[PDB]
Amino acid sequence: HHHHHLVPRGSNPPPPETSNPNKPKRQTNQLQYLLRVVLKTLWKHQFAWPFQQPVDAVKLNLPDYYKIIKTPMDMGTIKKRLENNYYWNAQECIQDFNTMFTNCYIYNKPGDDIVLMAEALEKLFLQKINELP
Ligand SMILES: CCN1C(=O)c2cccc3c(NS(=O)(=O)c4ccccc4C(=O)OC)ccc1c23
Numbered sequence: 001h002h003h004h005h006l007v008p009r010g011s012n013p014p015p016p017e018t019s020n021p022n023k024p025k026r027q028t029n030q031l032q033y034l035l036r037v038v039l040k041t042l043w044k045h046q047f048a049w050p051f052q053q054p055v056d057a058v059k060l061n062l063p064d065y066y067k068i069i070k071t072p073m074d075m076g077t078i079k080k081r082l083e084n085n086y087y088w089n090a091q092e093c094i095q096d097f098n099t100m101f102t103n104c105y106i107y108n109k110p111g112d113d114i115v116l117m118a119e120a121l122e123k124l125f126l127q128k129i130n131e132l133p
Helices: 029-043 075-083 090-107 113-129
Strands: none
Touching (some): 029 075, 029 113, 075 090, 090 113
16 A cells, blocks of 8 residues: 555644733733843853744654653743733743753753753753842
């Protein structure tokens, strides 16, 4: 038989929402600091780039990524959420950061380059979190 299963193909899932009109939202001084200080200082770091957008599992040849990671998160998503005033409190935003870092540590192994990058960014994140208003 001549069906060789070359289609249908893989794909990326849809990315996390950055808007939700029915979700409760606030602007708080902590959320303001999270955008202006925490996110913007991590964003400029030379290890930020793999984290600035959702994982493209097709481009990056990580076909197992969304098999293993079922709650993806990334800093582009967090940035957009912050810009859109998506969050109710600082905890929600912080949980998104925690999810991003945790995903990285789940998927990868100690000493992998991506893990060294995540560890550095997490260190910086935790320092910046300790001066939250
Ligand atoms: C942060 C999301 N992420 C991963 O968890 C991950 C694991 C393996 C490779 C890559 C990856 N591929 S990459 O080409 O951009 C890359 C980035 C940083 C360090 C190593 C690699 C890589 O795969 O080197 C071969 C991008 C984003 C992620 C990963």
